[PDB]
From Swiss-Prot, chain A:
UniProt free text on domains: The extracellular domain contributes to synaptic contact formation.
Compartment list: Postsynaptic cell membrane; Cell membrane; Cell projection, Dendrite; Cytoplasmic vesicle membrane
Impact reported for residue 2 to S: In DEE74; increases protein abundance; retained in the endoplasmic reticulum decreases; cell surface expression; decreases current amplitude in response to GABA; increases zinc sensitivity; accelerates activation and prolonges deactivation
Disease in which the protein is involved: Developmental and epileptic encephalopathy 74: A form of epileptic encephalopathy, a heterogeneous group of severe early-onset epilepsies characterized by refractory seizures, neurodevelopmental impairment, and poor prognosis. Development is normal prior to seizure onset, after which cognitive and motor delays become apparent. DEE74 is an autosomal dominant form with onset in the first year of life. Epilepsy, childhood absence 2: A subtype of idiopathic generalized epilepsy characterized by an onset at age 6-7 years, frequent absence seizures (several per day) and bilateral, synchronous, symmetric 3-Hz spike waves on EEG. Tonic-clonic seizures often develop in adolescence. Some individuals manifest febrile seizures. Absence seizures may either remit or persist into adulthood.
Protein's name in the database: Gamma-aminobutyric acid receptor subunit gamma-2
Residues in the Cytoplasmic compartment per record: 17-22
Stretches in topological domain Extracellular: 43-54
Coiled-coil positions: none
Family per record: Belongs to the ligand-gated ion channel (TC 1.A.9) family. Gamma-aminobutyric acid receptor (TC 1.A.9.5) subfamily. GABRG2 sub-subfamily.
Organism: Homo sapiens (Human)
Protein origin, superkingdom: Eukaryota
Subunit structure: Heteropentamer, formed by a combination of alpha (GABRA1-6), beta (GABRB1-3), gamma (GABRG1-3), delta (GABRD), epsilon (GABRE), rho (GABRR1-3), pi (GABRP) and theta (GABRQ) chains, each subunit exhibiting distinct physiological and pharmacological properties. Interacts with GABARAP. Interacts with KIF21B. Identified in a complex of 720 kDa composed of LHFPL4, NLGN2, GABRA1, GABRB2, GABRG2 and GABRB3. Interacts with LHFPL4. Interacts with SHISA7; interaction leads to the regulation of GABA(A) receptor trafficking, channel deactivation kinetics and pharmacology.
From Swiss-Prot, chain B:
Lineage: Eukaryota, Metazoa, Chordata, Craniata, Vertebrata
Assembly and interaction partners: Heteropentamer, formed by a combination of alpha (GABRA1-6), beta (GABRB1-3), gamma (GABRG1-3), delta (GABRD), epsilon (GABRE), rho (GABRR1-3), pi (GABRP) and theta (GABRQ) chains, each subunit exhibiting distinct physiological and pharmacological properties. Interacts with UBQLN1. May interact with KIF21B. Identified in a complex of 720 kDa composed of LHFPL4, NLGN2, GABRA1, GABRB2, GABRG2 and GABRB3.
Name under which the protein is recorded: Gamma-aminobutyric acid receptor subunit beta-2
Record text about domains: The extracellular domain contributes to synaptic contact formation.
Tissue expression pattern: Isoform 1 and isoform 2 show reduced expression in schizophrenic brain. Isoform 3 shows increased expression in schizophrenic and bipolar disorder brains while isoform 4 shows reduced expression.
Naturally occurring in which organism (per UniProt): Homo sapiens
Stretches assigned to the Extracellular side: 9-26
Coiled coil: none
Localization terms from the record: Postsynaptic cell membrane; Cell membrane; Cytoplasmic vesicle membrane
Protein family: Belongs to the ligand-gated ion channel (TC 1.A.9) family. Gamma-aminobutyric acid receptor (TC 1.A.9.5) subfamily. GABRB2 sub-subfamily.
Residues of the full protein shown: 285 to 331 of 512
């Protein structure tokens, strides 16, 4: 529940205006902070095994999602200055591509790990 | 990076020498620190000349 909530927290950056640069950067990087702290405090339950579990993969993909959201805003801020025709409809694409990708990941993950 | 190092530094014994993972964390910290310092340097020269 908290990692998914932090992913939706990173998602809310897309509806914020593209001109407020410190707002979106601070939101993304503080969301990255929260993901790291939650991941570290969550791995202290299980032993020091060297293989990937079904819990490491989930938090790893959540971190990747937050990383991708921040790097997407970074490329957005570079592209509004380089050429605006490509950066106008990128955020509107992200607003629908990020939740569908995360929901598809959740469906495939939960079925693949509850079938085993 | 400080939070990451802290977690690993507050889980191992007090040995005086520098480990390999400590060297990797110090290298990563020096890279992020140098990125912040280059930002300071590009914020300093921006008013005198933005070409540099
Ligand atoms: C220390 N740490 C983080 O900072 C957040 N992302 C990482 C990670 C992120 C991407 C790939 C591999 C590893 C992670 C994963 C676990 Cl299972 C526990 C702590 C943790
Ligand atoms: C042992 N060490 C240093 O001497 C360089 N400065 C520190 C520092 C600076 C501020 C707070 C905590 C630690 C640091 C940070 C990392 Cl992520 C890895 C190694 C390391």
């Amino acid at each position: 529940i908290p990692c998914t909530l932090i992913v939706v927290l990173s998602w809310v950056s897309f509806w914020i205006n593209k001109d407020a640069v410190p707002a979106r950067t601070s939101l993304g990087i503080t969301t990255v902070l929260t993901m790291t702290t939650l991941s570290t405090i969550a791995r202290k339950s299980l032993p020091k095994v060297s293989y990937v579990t079904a819990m490491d993969l989930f938090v790893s993909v959540c971190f990747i999602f937050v990383f991708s959201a921040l790097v997407e805003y970074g490329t957005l801020h570079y592209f509004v200055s380089s050429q605006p025709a490509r950066a106008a409809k990128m955020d509107s694409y992200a607003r629908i591509f990020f939740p569908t990708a995360f929901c598809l990941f959740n469906l495939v993950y939960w079925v693949s790990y509850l079938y085993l | 990076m400080t939070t990451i190092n802290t977690h690993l530094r507050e889980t191992l014994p007090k040995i005086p020498y520098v480990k390999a993972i400590d060297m990797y964390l110090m290298g990563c910290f020096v890279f992020v620190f140098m990125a912040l310092l280059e930002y300071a340097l590009v914020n300093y020269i921006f008013f005198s000349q933005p070409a540099r």
